[PDB]
Amino acid sequence: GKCKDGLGEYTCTSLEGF
Amino acid sequence: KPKLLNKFDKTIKAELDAAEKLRKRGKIEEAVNAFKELVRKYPQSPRARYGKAQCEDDLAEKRRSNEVLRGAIETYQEVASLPDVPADLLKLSLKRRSDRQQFLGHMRGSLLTLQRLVQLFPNDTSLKNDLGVGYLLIGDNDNAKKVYEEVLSVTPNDGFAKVHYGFILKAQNKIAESIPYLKEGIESGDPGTDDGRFYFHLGDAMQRVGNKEAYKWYELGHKRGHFASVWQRSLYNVNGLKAQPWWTPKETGYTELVKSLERNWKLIRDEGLAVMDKAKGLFLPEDENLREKGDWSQFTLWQQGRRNENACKGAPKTCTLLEKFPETTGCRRGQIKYSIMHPGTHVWPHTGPTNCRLRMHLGLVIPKEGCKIRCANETKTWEEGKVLIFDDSFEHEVWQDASSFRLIFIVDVWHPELTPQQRRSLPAI
Ligand SMILES: CC[C@H](CC(=O)O)C(=O)C(=O)O
Numbered sequence: 477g478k479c480k481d482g483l484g485e486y487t488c489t490s491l492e493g494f
Numbered sequence: 495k496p497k498l499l500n501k502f503d504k505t506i507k508a509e510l511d512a513a514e515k516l517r518k519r520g521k522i523e524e525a526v527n528a529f530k531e532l533v534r535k536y537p538q539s540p541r542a543r544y545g546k547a548q549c550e551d552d553l554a555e556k557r558r559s560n561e562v563l564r565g566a567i568e569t570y571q572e573v574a575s576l577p578d579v580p581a582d583l584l585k586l587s588l589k590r591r592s593d594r595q596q597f598l599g600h601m602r603g604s605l606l607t608l609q610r611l612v613q614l615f616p617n618d619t620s621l622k623n624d625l626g627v628g629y630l631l632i633g634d635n636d637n638a639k640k641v642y643e644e645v646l647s648v649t650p651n652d653g654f655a656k657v658h659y660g661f662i663l664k665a666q667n668k669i670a671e672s673i674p675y676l677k678e679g680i681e682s683g684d685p686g687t688d689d690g691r692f693y694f695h696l697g698d699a700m701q702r703v704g705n706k707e708a709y710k711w712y713e714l715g716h717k718r719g720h721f722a723s724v725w726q727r728s729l730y731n732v733n734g735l736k737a738q739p740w741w742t743p744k745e746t747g748y749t750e751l752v753k754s755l756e757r758n759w760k761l762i763r764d765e766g767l768a769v770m771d772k773a774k775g776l777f778l779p780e781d782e783n784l785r786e787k788g789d790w791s792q793f794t795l796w797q798q799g800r801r802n803e804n805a806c807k808g809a810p811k812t813c814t815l816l817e818k819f820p821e822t823t824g825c826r827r828g829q830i831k832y833s834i835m836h837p838g839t840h841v842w843p844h845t846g847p848t849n850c851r852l853r854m855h856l857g858l859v860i861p862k863e864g865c866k867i868r869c870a871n872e873t874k875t876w877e878e879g880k881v882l883i884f885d886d887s888f889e890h891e892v893w894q895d896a897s898s899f900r901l902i903f904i905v906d907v908w909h910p911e912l913t914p915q916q917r918r919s920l921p922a923i
């Protein structure tokens with residue numbers, strides 16, 4: 477799931493550390 | 495307070511303390527070598543192994559290297575593999591392991607660490623909450639829901655479990671049911687409940703059921719720093735970017751892009767219409783629960799700054815035209831897509847996720863009446879061959895009450911005040 481038009485996912489980014 | 499030394503570690507506490515002192519003085523390299531000496535001398539020592547791990551962790555922090563932090567993650571695991579580990583130390587070690595796995599974005603492995611933690615400590619409610627988050631982060635809402643139901647059945651007043659249950663319920667479109675959970679969990683003041691997500695979604699659910707109290711929660715969220723303002727409620731943002739609902743072409747500085755969209759609007763239209771006629775499955779229904787009713791679908795050419803090659807087979811000249819404008823094709827926090835909406839459609843008031851994009855709308859097929867878009871406190875209409883520009887991080891709403899379909903073209907650009915390096919580094923959305 478991705479945040480395209482809205483903010484429905486628990487998180488919208490997929491982080492990768494520093 | 496925490497009891498970290500088993501029986502044997504108490505007999506070498508002098509060495510363990512000397513090594514830990516080095517670590518807390520910031521002599522990371524010395525501490526690392528001292529704890530490695532202690533691990534080779536006392537290979538079963540949990541506290542020595544934990545010191546090695548904590549030193550690697552500090553080292554990754556100082557070097558800002560994920561490589562070093564992966565080493566620390568394995569050492570945290572090593573701690574829990576030793577014999578006679580004190581319970582407090584076992585929990586600290588595996589919790590920090592999970593947290594650093596999440597920091598790196600290793601959500602599946604973090605999930606595994608959390609399942610283990612809950613097996614080892616079946617009465618720790620906070621670990622069950624952390625496990626629920628592990629499930630949320632991999633997209634497993636069904637298991638997250640079960641976890642928080644368990645928590646609530648043993649601890650009905652746990653505010654963290656309440657807001658997270660409420661969030662799950664609302665994402666399932668259980669709007670009314672979600673409201674008491676989100677509200678009571680925020681009012682609990684428990685750690686983790688002061689989170690923009692819960693203010694955002696409690697206010698939204700209220701709006702959807704007609705509850706006039708939604709903007710009190712928006713104003714409280716703004717007062718507590720989650721929202722740039724009542725009307726602009728995005729959560730992934732760069733503070734300081736000019737914030738206004740509607741932009742002119744010149745205000746954006748993307749005047750060449752606008753000219754290109756407007757001057758060539760008929761070929762953009764015609765490629766979209768050919769996809770409608772001959773490849774309708776390329777249009778996908780909106781899948782973010784943003785409709786009160788109606789039919790709305792989108793045919794996406796770019797998302798997260800990545801061209802959909804198959805999609806561009808159906809709009810090849812449009813994709814070629816857009817390639818000239820990196821300000822949209824490289825906008826990793828926006829899309830390029832056709833958007834068709836049919837009569838009887840009402841899109842709920844909503845906000846996009848980031849203040850880092852502006853949203854262009856090029857009119858392609860616009861019925862004479864019935865179609866309109868409100869953003870913040872300004873309602874406007876489309877025109878065939880003309881671009882509108884708004885900041886969709888502001889609340890916006892759309893109606894389609896015409897007698898035939900409405901087709902627009904959506905082109906997202908980077909907020910113009912974002913620097914080149916910002917455009918290159920901000921994580922994709
Ligand atoms: C409310 C719908 C609108 C898109 C459209 O009208 O097709 C929207 O939310 C957006 O452009 O972000």
Ligand SMILES: [Mn+2]
Pocket residue numbers: 481844845846886890
């Ligand atoms: Mn929108």
